[PDB]
Amino acid sequence: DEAEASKFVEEYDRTSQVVWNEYAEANWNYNTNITTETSKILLQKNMQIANHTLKYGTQARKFDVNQLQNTTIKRIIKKVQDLERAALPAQELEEYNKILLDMETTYSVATVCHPNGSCLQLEPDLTNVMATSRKYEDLLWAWEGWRDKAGRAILQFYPKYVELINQAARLNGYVDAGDSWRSMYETPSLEQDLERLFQELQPLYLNLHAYVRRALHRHYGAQHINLEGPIPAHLLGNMWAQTWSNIYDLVVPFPSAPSMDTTEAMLKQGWTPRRMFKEADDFFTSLGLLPVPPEFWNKSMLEKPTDGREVVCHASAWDFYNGKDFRIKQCTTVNLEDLVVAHHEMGHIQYFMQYKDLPVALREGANPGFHEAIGDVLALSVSTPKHLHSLNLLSSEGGSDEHDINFLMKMALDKIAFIPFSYLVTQWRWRVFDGSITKENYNQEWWSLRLKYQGLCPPVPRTQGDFDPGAKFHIPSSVPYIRYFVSFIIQFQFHEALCQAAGHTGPLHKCDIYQSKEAGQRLATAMKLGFSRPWPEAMQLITGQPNMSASAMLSYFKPLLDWLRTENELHGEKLGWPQYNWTPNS
Ligand SMILES: *[C@@H]1O[C@H](CO[C@@H]2O[C@@H](C)[C@@H](O)[C@@H](O)[C@@H]2O)[C@@H](O[C@@H]2O[C@H](CO)[C@@H](O[C@@H]3O[C@H](CO)[C@@H](O)[C@H](O)[C@@H]3O)[C@H](O)[C@H]2NC(C)=O)[C@H](O)[C@H]1NC(C)=O
Ligand SMILES: *[C@@H]1O[C@H](CO)[C@@H](O)[C@H](O)[C@H]1NC(C)=O
Ligand SMILES: [Cl-]
Ligand SMILES: [Cl-]
Ligand SMILES: [Zn+2]
């Protein structure tokens, strides 16, 4: 009865802390030191954690959950009934675990080489080419080269990955892996909700897209941009065209109001990765939120090692499930983009610290998007010309309506452009998992969706054997993407709420929440819930209402919408890409 179920949950929490902590240390050791030995130890620890998951999952499934009264225990038990990959028979489990490691390793160590020349890694070398080169053919070399080396090499693994991850899902009572993932949101309306939200951002995105396309035409030439077609995917300042702010220089609304070069300013002033994380730590504590522990500074990997070594560079935050040991692993570069990423990662660390006294089963965000949003919310304030001037990374840009529209454009290039991208990635993998896209059409459907949602085209026709989704980290790493779409919507809701909590008046985009304890309190109360309640409860605690809504994001960018509509109107832009079949001729 109730006593047996309460006891079970207590034993699960005790044992899980121990085994999860062991697994986390082995996983960290491989991620920060990719070798045969650390791979071997990780794959061994995979079997140890599966043994535990199987043991407790099997006992959990013997409880009739709806006979149980207490709702917190009902909830933990239902969750422990999901064995995830541990539902697989032993041979398939070992195969699956090896496939995942091989995909991660392949992505993380791929390089692109000039013939008889230097070989470039994604971080920082190719990322730097995409962000700074203004030459069509140099950008193409990097963009195609990365797909040829990373994308194509992932293809041999992906169909077996999909088979095994779906098999695990069905064994746990889902129809496929995507169903399994989406279930974390506990929102039956989720599909419709995401479509509605995507549609509300259309006026802003289509106008931003049309304006950017016009500027690219100006720079790259009339023979290379079709003003009524999709934009070549290598021209947007980012390897995946997911965020476009690195081409700010090409699209400045008011060039008479130029901004300080922020990378130059950071470097000349001796900014370092540690300083970047220290500044993030300060922002959190200014809100009354928790500082990271001394152990964090000892054990974190805040830059790429120099001791001849392979690591997974992609930025991540790590909970070691003992309530003390939290770490970030990031190949940090000294620039503004990575300052924002550092805040994002520190938001994950904050969430870990806030829910650390919950049972480990409930040590997650209210939904995964909440976990992604916390750091980004603070980074919105960090990004204001006010805050950046106070860091001496910008001159005084206060006052002018020119600098103001410029600032909004700079933010839009990341925040608005990302909405269709995150939607695309979500939809593609959804349809791979549900079987609507097979290995016969992985790449063709990727590009159909790239066109349909983002209005982008590949600069070079794709060929058989290309697997461009493989060249995006989250695909081989099997990290869900819907979280980021959700994050980008809700972070503006949170910003709007925290700003009114802090007593900001005037346009939302001028808000800076630095030092607001009232704002800190809203966040903390929500984060302390972890995964203990339906996510609308945490949304309510932060915002005073329970829905996901694009209205805050639209309010923030309202003055840019007006400016873009006027600008595009006078140039006669035809929004969208009615000439959707257009691709580059040369
Ligand atoms: C349903 O059950 C939950 C969970 O209860 C806890 O875990 C069980 C498996 C058993 O081990 C229980 O002995 C244990 O209480 C109940 O939620 C818990 O309620 C208590 C009492 O309100 C909360 O106590 C707080 O604890 C913090 C310190 O951690 C103090 O600072 C607070 O002042 C306060 O005393 C406890 O946090 C809470 N735990 C969780 C995980 O939610 C719940 O009350 C119960 N429902 C009903 C209707 O009885
Ligand atoms: C890297 O890996 C090996 C185990 O393969 C280990 O002996 C060594 O201590 C590790 N090096 C670092 C810098 O962690
Ligand atoms: Cl691509
Ligand atoms: Cl997700
Ligand atoms: Zn994140």
Numbering used by the authors: 40 to 625
Question: How is this structure described in the published paper?
Answer:
Somatic angiotensin-converting enzyme (sACE), a key regulator of blood pressure and electrolyte fluid homeostasis, cleaves the vasoactive angiotensin-I, bradykinin, and a number of other physiologically relevant peptides. sACE consists of two homologous and catalytically active N- and C-domains, which display marked differences in substrate specificities and chloride activation. There is also a smaller testicular form of ACE (tACE), which is transcribed from the same gene and identical to the C-domain of ACE. The active site for both domains is contained within the large central groove, with the signature HEXXH zinc-binding motif residing on the α15 helix.
A high resolution data set was collected for the D465T mutant. The native Asp465 side chain is stabilized by a salt bridge with Arg468 as well as hydrogen bonds with the main chain of Tyr520 and Ile521. Interestingly, this also led to a change in rotamer conformation of Trp469, which went from a water-mediated interaction with Asp465 to a hydrogen bond with Arg221. This created a new pocket that permitted the presence of a malonate molecule (a component of the crystallization buffer; data not shown). Noticeably, loop Ser434–Ser439 was visible for the first time in a C-domain crystal structure with clear electron density observed for this flexible loop region. Given that Asp465 is one of very few contacts between helices α23 and α20, its role is most likely in stabilization of the C-terminal end of helix α23. The maximum specific activity in the presence of chloride (SAmax) and the activity at 0 mm NaCl as a percentage of maximal activity (%SAmax) for D465T with both HHL and Z-FHL were lower than those of the C-domain. The Thr in this position is capable of fewer potential hydrogen bonds, resulting in more structural movement that affects the C-terminal carboxylate coordinating Tyr520 (lowering of SAmax).
